[PDB]
Amino acid sequence: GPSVFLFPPKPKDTLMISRTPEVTCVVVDVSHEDPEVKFNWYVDGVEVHNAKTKPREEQYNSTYRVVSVLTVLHQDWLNGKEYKCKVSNKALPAPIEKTISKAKGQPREPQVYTLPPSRDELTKNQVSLTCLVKGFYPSDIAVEWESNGQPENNYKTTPPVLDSDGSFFLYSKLTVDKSRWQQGNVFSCSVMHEALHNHYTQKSLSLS
């Protein structure tokens, strides 16, 4: 039968009030014969009725995929309220209920360390700028790169990795042309986490 997966909001969306966080209830392996799917959302117990259901997206394995989105309040998610999604389809032995919430555990502030490129890498034409973020909890975090107000987009960030002391860490790699780095340009690693003041901090990296 159809499976159900429940996803949390994006970390940036819960930390920034100008953004809209939302929990996502994905239903996969929905048969062609029984496509209709009903959604029941429950916040901490009480039922809400403000969630929207996106149209079915036919997949490349002879099944449909239904998605329901429930916008959440920033405080409710961060304070640990529980979101429940009940999926009822005319082909399940019983409606499936899934539940997610914040991780529970004392939050810990992320330490941010910018790392210059290795001298051995200056042979190449592009150079790797590194941002180490370690010691934070929970794993919900957002990392970005900018250079004097302008977003640097050619970057990749590893997923959060559980560390030996219970906290999390990750690395973010920004790739810039070596000439920009040798020219003394200033790059910035913007990190967003609930344990930071104003949910924000940033560190700069520059040749000297």
Epitope: L15, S18, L78, Y200, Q202
Partner: antibody, heavy 122, light 109 residues
């Protein structure tokens, strides 16, 4: 505009505690982070801490951690800074400040209270 | 933490002359989060400039800011009498937020 009005001058003995209030009137309260900045007589400005009233999670400069508690009451639109175990080196003016952009975006200090002189005198 | 160093300590100029105030950062910082404030005696700081160069609303055009990296400057093209106070630079890109020592402008007579 927003109006930040703090409580009056305080005189305390060492070791005692003080709690300065900062009522915000005019604009929306919960979404904007309120910070506390202090200034010793004749000296410069030092950021003590801050809080976003909507989330209730304060943050502090390392030198004040374990000594300052910052809170925010949404029902009365009032931010508080409480400093326990007062030292004479805490004698300073304390300002509350915000804050044009909502929480999550880096911002400057645009609105300021009138200041609260805290004297630690025997 | 980031240390802002302001120069000079006191600046003695006459009304009508040009003023330059420097703010050296201990390390490179994004210019998008450098602010300048003015403070008169017995008053709270007033925001002059943010983003290193953008002028706050309702600030006379004689105040301008510039710089990047570790070197930022606040220039008053033509000093008015109410421009003689103390000026602070402040970064707000990373906690803790930090201020320079301040520079005092006094009237040269």
């Amino acid at each position: 505009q927003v109006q930040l009005v703090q409580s009056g001058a305080e005189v305390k003995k060492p070791g005692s505690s003080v709690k300065v209030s900062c009522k915000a009137s005019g604009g929306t309260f919960s979404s904007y982070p309120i910070s506390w900045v202090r200034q010793a007589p004749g000296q410069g400005l030092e950021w003590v801490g801050g809080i976003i009233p909507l989330f209730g999670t304060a943050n502090y400069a390392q030198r004040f951690q374990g000594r300052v508690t910052i809170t925010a009451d949404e029902s009365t639109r009032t931010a508080y800074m409480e400093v326990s175990t007062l030292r004479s080196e805490d004698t300073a003016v304390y300002y509350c400040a915000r804050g044009i952009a909502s929480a999550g975006t880096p911002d400057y200090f645009f609105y300021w209270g009138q200041g609260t002189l805290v004297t630690v005198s025997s | 933490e980031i240390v802002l160093t302001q120069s000079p300590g006191t600046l003695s100029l006459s009304p009508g002359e040009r003023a330059t105030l420097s703010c050296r950062a201990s390390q490179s910082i994004s210019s998008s989060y450098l602010a300048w404030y003015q403070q008169r005696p017995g008053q709270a700081p007033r925001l002059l400039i943010y983003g290193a160069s953008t002028r706050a609303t309702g600030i006379p055009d004689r105040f301008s800011g510039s710089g990047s990296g570790t070197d930022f400057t606040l220039t008053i093209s033509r000093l008015e009498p109410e421009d003689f106070a103390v000026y602070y630079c402040q970064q707000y890109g990373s906690s803790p937020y930090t201020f320079g020592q301040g520079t005092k402008l006094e009237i040269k007579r």
